[PDB]
Amino acid sequence: LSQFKDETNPLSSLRHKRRISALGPGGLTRERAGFDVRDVHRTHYGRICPVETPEGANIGLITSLAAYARVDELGFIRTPYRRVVGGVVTDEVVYMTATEEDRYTIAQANTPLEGNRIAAERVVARRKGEPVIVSPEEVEFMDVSPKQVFSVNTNLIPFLEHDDANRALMGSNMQTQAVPLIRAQAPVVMTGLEERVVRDSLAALYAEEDGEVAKVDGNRIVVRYEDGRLVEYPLRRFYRSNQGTALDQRPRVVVGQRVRKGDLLADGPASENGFLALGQNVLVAIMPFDGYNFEDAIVISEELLKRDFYTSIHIERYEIEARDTKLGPERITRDIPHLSEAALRDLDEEGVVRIGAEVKPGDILVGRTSFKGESEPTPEERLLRSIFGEKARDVKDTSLRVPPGEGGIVVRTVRLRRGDPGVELKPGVREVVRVYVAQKRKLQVGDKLANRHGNKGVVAKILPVEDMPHLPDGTPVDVILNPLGVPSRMNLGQILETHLGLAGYFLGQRYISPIFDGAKEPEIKELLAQAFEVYFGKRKGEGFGVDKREVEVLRRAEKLGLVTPGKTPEEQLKELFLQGKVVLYDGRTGEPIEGPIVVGQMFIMKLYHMVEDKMHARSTGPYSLITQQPLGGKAQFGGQRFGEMEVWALEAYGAAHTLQEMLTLKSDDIEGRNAAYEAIIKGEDVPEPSVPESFRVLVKELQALALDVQTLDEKDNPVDIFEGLASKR
């Protein structure tokens, strides 16, 4: 039941903190029984978010709870409902138990009201998980707010009302995987909780009571409250999240500043201005390019990387120990026994790497030296030493190196010596060493991003702003989405965001659309009309009117039926601008793209690059003791699984030797893999496969069981698998 804190981002940490599970002591629920349980039951109202659960084998069982849902005395998640006597509503509320809930007639909050008086006779209400249209007279209790039925996690999506529940989970789940960006900006559109989140979570730091500002260090901020008190508030400089993420608090206030009780002091890891901010709002073009935004493929502007827009600071806590072998305690020293001084530069401090140094895959992070043999010296390695320089330090190199993939800059180091001040030093362990290194994993092409709605995609190309699409006004887009991945998936909620974000750019402002009660289509056209004044009004006064390009498309647009023919292009454009689409020039050819293309400020996010992101490529390496199948982990990547699903595929094809190759020389065949390596090194042709181990070990298992498994030849007679290790004496 208890797990690592998904501290991707304080929010991620906060949800990982609110989710409910099924599996457990075992007396409660087992794993293979759940069709009726995993169902989103009718009482799950305002108590359980029916969106929060994880997609996969373990679904419905694991699920975080609703907004206000709270446990009373004995685990009964009550949910609030305002009281109402007659046709009169109350500012009073009651947390009702699921049981007591069915007892009454509850109504939605969408319900019109004069402050305390209902407004419609035939108004909606829900009896016991049953939709019933009742009169204002039989009304006994109402929902507090639409937010109460979803999780905090889920309550964060703008136009959730226009998106499908299924892709909503993807939106909700993907939020727990966000990553703290150096530059964090709260969503161009919010629902109104991002403040609350950071507040209720301990992201940002708040002011206790009214007061004034004293010291504003990059490490500490001291204040003098109005009650004559003053405190020094230390700031978490740079700490390693359990997920290996950055944890800092960025002051945003100046010295000597009269502050209000509970005003943002320093921005938490991911708060723009005490507002939850993860990812940034980007200008985006909802159009298809060559193929770079294929099915869920995406296209980025080199312009975004220039202004370190999407950069993630990631911290991996590699770790190594100085074991005490009876062959001789593994020593820690800058002595790397065999080859260069070139690789001993950065390892300044005796054994220690200097902080603030650039580390690439393959470099030694920490030097370690144990002893060569198991217990005896070596006869072939003995004569070789004497030749060049018999006097060579017998200690072996078992030094922590930069695992292939990527390394960054060592920022912090920790070393625990003999005289334990007060630490639980495991037995045999002489001493330990932790190294924290981070890298501006610059949003590269391999990375993936997604909006709060569910659209998921991997960056296909990093176009130079030079030729990527640009507005009639020099300003170029940041990203280009593939429309295709939109009609199929059901979430017009994002289309409304790009549009609304559109206004905000030339209107320079943010907004807050509650869940079901947020903004509306007409209202949006309003602002657009107004934003069109910013875009073109400015363009008109700036000395010029329209381009021959803006008209070619206008011709095509009128023919389209997007614009009512017969209007002055000035008017036509406005009408087309209100449609959420504007004209865009190719930038590569500068020829406009026949047909207006909607665009907008879409708030999108970067997604977790597990060490599963940083690729795994293996040639040769470790194998399993029992099964002689290859594996990795620390340094050696670790092989990939072939699975039968795949076997069969090859089985479909006539890949006989290709299949032979896999089962053997490539995985289990010992003398095959061995001699194989020797073969390719020679540029020769692989010998013929010997018996795989998983097989040999298998027979013996069988033989261990009374079962006797014997190999046979053409004419039913013995053959020998065990090359000669089965015969006695």
């Binding site: 099915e295 590269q444 293996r618 199948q629 094809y653 030797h657 290790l725």
Partner: protein, 1151 residues
């Protein structure tokens, strides 16, 4: 160095135990803490299992490879690696016998069945309890003469003295049994008495023969010596700080030593019966522990984790058992994986790969290449140079860039459903992380770009490198092994761009449209266009003004105006081609020219290029198909790469983007939602006075919203058809590109009305979908993700069975000469009353495409020779002819009737190899059919019933369930019972029902696969039959049919004495067909892995290795593919070596 052609499971003789065994484990002394060395002769002593060190020994007399096969005169140690240890077994001399629980507790207790005692409870009763027996003779009484084989207790046995018991009791029994004697005894009991007692004797008789026949006699069933698994096998490691992990077998292997040793001391100390047994219970129980845990209670490791220590069974059977481990194979050395990202420029022939990865991959190939150049002196040197990323010189990148040459690799997607789930490409090194995949394959491996992760390997052997770039190279795998249909079909992206350009536009027709005749209609109606009255695309039949104003000579001519902004590609113009005055749009012709560009044969291009209509997914499907056919593989390839780029670039500029206003709402809904809401009250006010009831009020409301939803579905698409032919959301759905059909509106109904949690069933997504309206639909999207979840499990599982059975099925042949053909029906009887109808286009295509005629046929006027392979063009011919009324069925060769015992001929199968020409001999069809079947099975789309009244729309969909009940003989929930069907109409009939009764599904899901595959399978279900008139072996028996074609063929033909082998055809489910197969190598793989061998040991089964499953596990080259004896031997020669051997000939003339 030969090849193992047969595997054999047989019981083990005590001596054979001694045989595999090296020394005897006699004490539970693993390893003593102070010394990480094996304690004593314990379970880890190296004598008993193997050299604790490489080639090295104990004290150190001999230490290298020079003397690998000699032992040290002082302490005995021959050495290879430590493998020897993980190889060698051990044996424990048990005090008093005990027996394998596998045979004792197997449903048909293989021991209680054989020995007639209460097949079940009595076993339990004395085996783990107290009851003694008498050996040969015992002259004195108890009340009745010596019980030659009956049992007595120690009490009326103790009295006597002044015999053996437990498992020591049945030990004697088995020995004194003269199989023969009792064989004669049951043969009689079987046929004479009635079914009651005759029935038992019968099943009871299989076990016996089993022993005798095979020889391997049954006396070994009891245990007195236990084989010890090598050491290395069950781990004994150093976790951390001092922690140690050891395979649980050791916790039980110790539980066992203690008691046996405890017993040797107990029996040698004093013998108080009570406690003697108390421990024999614990003994025999610990026995079962390591063999099988759970079959009887479950032993736990002391307080820390109440987890049943994994037993031998659990190790062999299961989803991740041992067979599970092997049958599927698990970890390559040269592998890798990373995220995917599109490669537009990428040609099918190649694929983009991050250098950095490559680096590690072709490490060896590179290394060698290093020394080859001046970059590195020696190997070790080259490695050190690469040990770090900042040590790399730019020159290295050249060498690597060099070793890869044309060398190619394979790409695997997440779920590997079919052969295309993996393909070979020409890696073109690249910077960064992600991996560039070509897009049209996205459909092959069901994969979109939303985070998709896949794998990759390298054809090391030049032999293995060969096949890859050859038969695995994607470019050569265009068609679908499922449907002769291509699988490189343009996708949602390209196609979108391709449709844009070729669509024709129609605008306004307010004034005259009949230029068809008037010349004043040419002048006047031409000035009206110049004006504002007549548009450029008016609905005039002879030619709208668009054609009149502009006329183009040469092709180029026309395109020059477009760019000049005089004409748009979607305009109806008039242009002349190589020989015709044609009236068509700029886009339609452009498409034509491009066609001619990719491939030079300009004339053969337009032959299949109907540029009448806007290019849709099927028209392109039909063209790609064509191309591949007419022109040839590689040439049809240079094509795909072309369309790709253009449908890509065409998409960019098309300027299509979804807008909120784009999702346009019909003005219509308000009226119809009103005309329907008014009828709801006519039916609700129906409720007040009892014209109806409860059941009927519910059904009529269902039909109201079932007919009204289909009504709003036509309207949105009709409006887009007449008013907005070019809507991003519309044009998207119509093109193969992207969209949904039942789904959009169906989706709307779903959000508006979704069924309740159980199943008992106003807003759009454009307009606010109300609060509750969103929670109601949640129940379904909730059930949908769960249903599909179990569906993937059953699909791979189903398919797992497909392979379990059709693996062995391959094309090793010479036209199976048995010409017993199947007749393919063209007309279907009952869809209403009694009527005759022409089956569907598709279905029929699916039944006859690329097949083999059993006999000649003269239809409409052409002569269809016997044996010819009919192409789709021919398959169409018949249609037109049946339409005529000259033909009703079709004599066709098929596997169901192919002769070839194990395998099928090239004639019984057909056309479609990945290519279109006849299938090449040595093709693993058993698999290809299995995949092409199991890949579609997962998605498991919607199933339900939808019924209307007056408009009258009834929809019919069903789930995998049936598919299951089908492949597995079963008794459907409500359906035609096969067992009865066969009885009624016989084989050729059931055969036919199955197949057709299985096709209905996919037909109902949009999926399109050929019947071949299914046949394959079903024939496999009917490869066994029962008996009725004996010859060699007794009647009632289920066995291999063809194998009977063998014995019968010889009982009449060769050896005289016509002993009619009256048999009875037997039906078996896919499951049960695999379960019981000749080879057990395949059977041991699935099910318990218990019974499988249990049965195959008794009978020293000589598993003739034919088939892949069995031969794969061995890691032996596949009996097929390249291992097909047909081709596995083939020599190549240069004309220079020919005359050479010819001279080895000319020199033979002596003196």
């Amino acid at each position: 160095k030969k090849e193992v052609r047969k595997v054999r499971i047989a019981l083990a003789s005590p001596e054979k135990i001694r045989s595999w065994s090296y020394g005897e484990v006699e004490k539970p002394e693993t390893i003593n803490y102070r010394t990480l060395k094996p304690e004593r002769d314990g379970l880890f002593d190296e004598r008993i299992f193997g050299p604790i060190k490489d080639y090295e020994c104990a004290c150190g007399k001999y230490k290298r490879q020079r003397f690998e096969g000699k032992v040290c005169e002082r302490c005995g140690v021959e050495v290879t690696k430590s493998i020897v240890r993980r190889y060698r077994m051990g044996h424990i001399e048990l005090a008093t016998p005990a027996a394998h629980i596998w045979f004792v507790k197997d449903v048909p207790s293989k021991i209680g069945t054989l020995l007639d005692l209460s097949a079940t409870e009595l076993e339990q009763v004395l085996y783990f309890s107290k009851y003694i027996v008498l050996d040969p003779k015992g002259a004195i009484l108890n009340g009745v003469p010596v019980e030659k084989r009956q049992l007595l207790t120690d009490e009326e046995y103790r009295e006597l003295r002044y015999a053996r018991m437990g498992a020591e009791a049945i030990q004697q029994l088995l020995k004194e049994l003269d199989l023969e004697a009792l064989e004669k005894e049951l043969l009689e009991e079987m046929k004479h008495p009635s079914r009651a007692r005759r029935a038992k004797a019968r099943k009871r008789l299989e076990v016996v023969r089993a022993f005798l026949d095979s020889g391997n006699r049954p006396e070994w069933m009891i245990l007195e010596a236990v084989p010890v698994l090598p050491p290395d096998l069950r781990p004994m490691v150093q976790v951390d700080g001092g922690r140690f992990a050891t395979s649980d077998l050791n916790d039980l292997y110790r539980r066992l030593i203690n008691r046996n040793n405890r017993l040797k001391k107990l029996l040698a100390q004093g013998a108080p019966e009570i406690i003697i047994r108390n421990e024999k219970r614990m003994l025999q129980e610990a026995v079962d522990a390591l063999l099988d845990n759970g079959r009887r209670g479950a032993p736990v490791t002391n307080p820390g984790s109440d987890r049943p220590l994994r037993s031998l069974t659990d190790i062999l059977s299961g989803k991740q058992g041992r067979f599970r481990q092997n049958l599927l194979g698990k970890r390559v050395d040269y592998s890798g994986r990373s995220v995917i990202v599109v490669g537009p420029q990428l040609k099918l022939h190649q694929c983009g790969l991050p250098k950095r990865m490559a680096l590690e991959l072709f490490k060896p190939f590179l290394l060698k290449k290093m020394e080859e150049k001046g970059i590195a002196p020696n190997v070790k040197a080259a490695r050190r140079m690469l040990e770090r990323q900042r040590d790399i010189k730019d020159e290295v990148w050249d060498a690597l860039e060099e070793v890869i040459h044309g060398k190619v690799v394979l790409l695997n997607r997440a779920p590997t459903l079919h052969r295309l789930g993996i393909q070979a490409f020409q890696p073109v090194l690249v910077e960064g992380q992600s991996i560039q995949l070509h897009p049209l394959v996205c459909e092959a491996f069901n994969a979109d770009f939303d985070g998709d992760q896949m794998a990759v390997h390298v054809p090391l052997s030049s032999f293995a490198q060969a096949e890859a770039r050859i038969q695995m190279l994607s470019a050569h795998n265009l068609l679908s092994p499922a449907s002769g249909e291509p699988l490189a079909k343009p996708s949602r992206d390209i196609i979108l761009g391709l449709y844009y350009i070729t669509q024709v536009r129609k605008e306004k027709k307010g004034a005259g449209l009949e230029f068809a005749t008037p010349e004043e209609a040419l002048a006047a109606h031409e000035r009206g266009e110049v004006a504002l009255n007549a548009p450029i695309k008016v609905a005039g039949r002879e030619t709208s003004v668009g054609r009149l104003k502009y006329v183009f000579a040469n092709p180029d001519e026309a395109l020059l105006a477009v760019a000049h902004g005089i004409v748009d590609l979607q305009d109806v113009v008039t242009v002349r081609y190589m020989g015709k005055r044609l009236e068509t749009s700029p886009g339609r012709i452009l498409f034509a020219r491009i066609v001619a560009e990719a491939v030079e044969d300009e004339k053969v291009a337009w032959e299949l290029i109907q540029l009448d209509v806007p290019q849709e997914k099927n028209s392109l499907k039909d063209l790609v198909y064509q191309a591949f056919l007419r022109l040839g593989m590689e040439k049809t390839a240079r094509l795909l790469d072309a369309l790709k780029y253009y449908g890509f670039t065409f998409s960019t500029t098309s300027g299509i983007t979804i807008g909120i206003d784009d999702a346009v709402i019909p003005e219509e809904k308000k009226q119809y939602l009103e005309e329907a809401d008014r009828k709801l009250l006519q039916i609700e006010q129906a409720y007040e006075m009892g014209f109806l009831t409860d059941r009927e009020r519910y059904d009529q409301i269902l039909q109201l919203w079932t007919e009204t939803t289909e009504k709003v579905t036509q309207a949105v698409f009709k409006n887009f058809e007449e008013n907005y032919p070019f809507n991003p959301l519309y044009v998207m759905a119509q093109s193969g590109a992207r969209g949904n059909p039942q789904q959009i509106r169906q989706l709307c109904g779903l959000r508006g009305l979704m069924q309740k949690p159980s199943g008992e069933t106003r807003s759009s997504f454009r307009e606010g979908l109300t609060v509750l309206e969103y929670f109601i639909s949640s129940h379904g999207a909730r059930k949908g993700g769960a249903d599909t979840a179990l569906r993937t499990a059953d699909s791979g599982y189903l398919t797992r069975k497909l392979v379990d059975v059709t693996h062995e099925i391959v094309v090793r042949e010479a036209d199976c000469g048995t010409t017993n053909y199947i007749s393919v029906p063209l007309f279907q009887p009952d869809e209403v009353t009694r009527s005759l109808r022409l089956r569907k286009r598709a279905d029929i295509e699916a039944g006859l495409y690329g097949r083999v005629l059993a006999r000649e046929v003269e239809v409409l006027g052409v002569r269809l020779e016997e044996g010819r392979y009919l192409s789709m063009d021919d398959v169409h011919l018949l249609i037109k002819a049946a339409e005529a009324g000259e033909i009703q069925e079709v004599p066709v060769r098929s596997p169901l009737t192919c002769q070839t015992r194990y395998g099928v001929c090239q004639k019984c199968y057909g056309y479609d190899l990945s290519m279109a020409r006849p299938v090449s001999i040595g093709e693993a069809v058993g698999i290809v059919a299995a995949q092409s079947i199991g890949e579609p099975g997962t998605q498991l789309t919607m199933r339900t019933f939808h019924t209307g009244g007056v408009a009258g729309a009834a929809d019919i969909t069903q789930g995998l369930p049936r598919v299951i009940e089908l492949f597995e003989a079963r008794r459907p929930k409500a359906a035609i019972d096969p067992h009865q069907l066969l009885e009624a109409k016989g084989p050729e009939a059931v055969e036919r029902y199955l197949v057709e009764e299985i096709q209905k599904v996919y037909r109902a899901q949009g999926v399109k696969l050929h019947d071949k595959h299914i046949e394959i399978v079903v024939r496999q279900m009917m490869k066994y039959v029962e008996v009725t008139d004996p010859g060699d072996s007794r009647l009632l028996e289920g066995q291999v049919l063809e194998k009977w074609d063998v014995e019968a063929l010889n009982e009449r033909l060769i050896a005289e004495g016509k002993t009619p082998v009256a048999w009875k055809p037997l039906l078996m489910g896919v499951t049960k067909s695999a379960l019981s197969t000749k080879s057990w190598l395949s059977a041991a793989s699935f099910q318990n892995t218990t019974h499988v061998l249990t049965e195959a040991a008794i009978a020293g089964k000589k598993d003739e290795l034919i088939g892949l499953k069995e031969n794969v596990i061995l890691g032996r080259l596949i009996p097929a593919g390249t291992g097909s004896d047909f081709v596995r031997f083939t020599q190549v020669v240069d004309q220079k070596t020919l005359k050479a051997i010819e001279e080895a000939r000319k020199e033979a003339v002596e003196a």
